[PDB]
């Protein structure tokens, strides 16, 4: 019942703010809904052939889509009233979920492109004369040496961070069965192809 979406970059122009913008601007995202115009303005909808909006002065390379007038509402159309600005870009949350429990929680998954530390240029950095002057006291150890690097719940605990809203919480408040839309995120996302 949960889509494995890690960030809301999927909802680029398909979120609530974009739909508010489309309703206010009388257009509609292809996958989005259609609305009655917020203000009729039929007389002003069809403006005259001004010297400013003169098509003979307009260079056409790629037609201005409805999405363009929603991505940058204040730049691409006149009279952008009651319009909303959508979140530009959440950083791509590069989360790599484990596929086998029988594998270390901290693992260099093949999905990662290899780092391939190059030795073409010998990396030179100021490092003192080795093993001659500085010595650690016998009571000095790494902070958590007894603690293991990962337990059995480390992978599942990390995968809980990148989980839908009800499942990324440790605690919370009890809701009513009415107030829990199980299929709300099914139509909030894009319709499956075919």
């Amino acid at each position: 019942l949960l889509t494995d979406l890690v960030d809301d970059n999927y909802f680029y122009l398909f979120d609530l703010k974009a739909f508010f913008t489309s309703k206010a601007l009388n257009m509609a995202i292809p996958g989005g809904p259609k609305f009655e115009p917020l203000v009729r303005d039929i007389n002003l909808q069809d403006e005259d052939w001004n010297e400013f909006n003169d098509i003979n002065k307009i260079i056409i390379r790629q037609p201005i889509r409805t999405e363009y007038k929603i991505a940058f509402p204040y730049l691409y159309n006149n009279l952008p009233h009651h319009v909303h600005l959508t979140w530009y870009h959440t950083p791509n949350v590069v989360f790599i979920k484990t596929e086998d429990p029988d594998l270390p929680a901290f693992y260099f998954d093949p999905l990662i492109n290899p780092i391939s530390h190059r030795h073409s240029v010998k990396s030179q950095e100021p490092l003192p004369d080795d093993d001659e002057e500085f010595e650690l006291p016998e009571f000095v150890e790494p902070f958590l040496k007894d603690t293991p690097l990962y337990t059995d719940n480390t992978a599942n605990g990390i995968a809980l961070l990148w989980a839908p809203r009800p499942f990324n919480l440790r605690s919370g408040r009890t809701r009513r069965a009415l107030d829990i839309p199980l299929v709300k995120n099914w139509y909030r996302e894009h319709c499956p192809a075919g």
Binding site: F106, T147, L149, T151, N156, L161
Partner: peptide, 23 residues
């Protein structure tokens, strides 16, 4: 140490987090 503290906090709040915080 950073890996281990983050792992304990994000995976073992109820079991080993108080122990590693006392440590």
């Amino acid at each position: 140490p950073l890996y281990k503290i983050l792992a304990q906090v994000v995976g073992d709040v109820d079991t080993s987090l108080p122990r590693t915080l006392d440590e």
